[PDB]
Design a protein around this ligand. Structure first.
Ligand SMILES: OC[C@H]1O[C@@H](O)[C@H](O)[C@@H](O)[C@@H]1O
Ligand SMILES: [Mg+2]
Length: 244
């Protein structure tokens, strides 16, 4: 029903360069009816909302928050997505395992939710510890996923979650094709978006994990932008000739 499904992360992607953000929102504001907009952020809904007030984020159609662990529709939280993410999820067990790693420190309570267990990796600790955590957690047989971004943030989510799986769920809900979709990201918590078959753009200021990911899995649907922050989205839109 629209020609584009724009999905983007906020911090360091849409947000970061105020001028680029404003001229991106200026362009989009002249063709608002031609696209669905969804923010796929690692922030909680309340936190994303607070960011909107600070930088003046244009009202999106959907909010895919906490790395896609929660989906907000114009009319409210998606309870189907929640129940779907709840099947076979054993938060307490996974948390007990992760809490036992000396190199991991729990992130603040407000960063946690029923489908998201987050920690910070010690800056002095060896990153291979994430690999050990991942192997240990998966051997529990509990459908879990490990997200590592900015060499510091660790997120434990159900396998069914991901900014990418939430995206595919949204595409199906909106009857939008991958070819009509554009995902934008900067870090390891956006890899799930690029695993999707949608067109994607990696901001110039992308984190090391994402750049390394691109080097190995990058395909022709993946565009590595020269512009950083919001500028990369305008650039990608021109590249894939979207909003023709
Ligand atoms: O997803 C990676 C990180 O993104 C941040 O935006 C969230 O506040 C944090 O909880 C998470 O660990
Ligand atoms: Mg990100």
């Amino acid at each position: 029903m629209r020609q584009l499904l724009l999905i983007s992360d906020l911090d360091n992607t849409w947000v970061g360069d105020q001028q680029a953000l404003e001229h991106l929102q200026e362009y989009l504001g002249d063709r608002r009816g031609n696209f669905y907009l969804a923010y796929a952020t690692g922030r909680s809904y309340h936190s994303a909302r607070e960011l909107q007030k600070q930088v003046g984020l244009m009202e999106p159609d959907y909010w895919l928050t906490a790395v896609g662990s929660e989906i907000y529709h114009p009319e409210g939280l998606d309870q189907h997505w929640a129940d779907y993410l709840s099947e076979h999820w054993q938060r307490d067990i996974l948390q007990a395992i992760a809490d036992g790693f000396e190199a991991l420190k729990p992130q603040s309570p407000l960063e946690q939710n029923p489908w998201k267990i987050s920690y910070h990796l010690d800056p002095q600790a060896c990153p291979t510890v994430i690999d050990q955590l991942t192997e240990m957690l998966k051997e529990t047989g509990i459908p879990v996923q490990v997200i590592f971004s900015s060499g510091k943030d660790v997120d434990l989510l159900p396998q069914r979650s991901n900014k990418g799986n939430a995206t595919q769920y949204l595409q199906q809900h909106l009857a939008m094709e991958p070819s009509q979709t554009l995902v934008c990201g900067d870090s390891g918590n956006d890899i799930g978006l690029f695993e999707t078959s949608a067109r994607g753009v990696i901001v110039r200021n992308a984190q090391p994990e994402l750049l390394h990911w691109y080097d190995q899995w990058g395909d022709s649907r993946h565009y590595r932008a020269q512009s950083s922050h919001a500028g990369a989205i305008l650039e990608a839109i021109a590249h894939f000739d979207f909003l023709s």
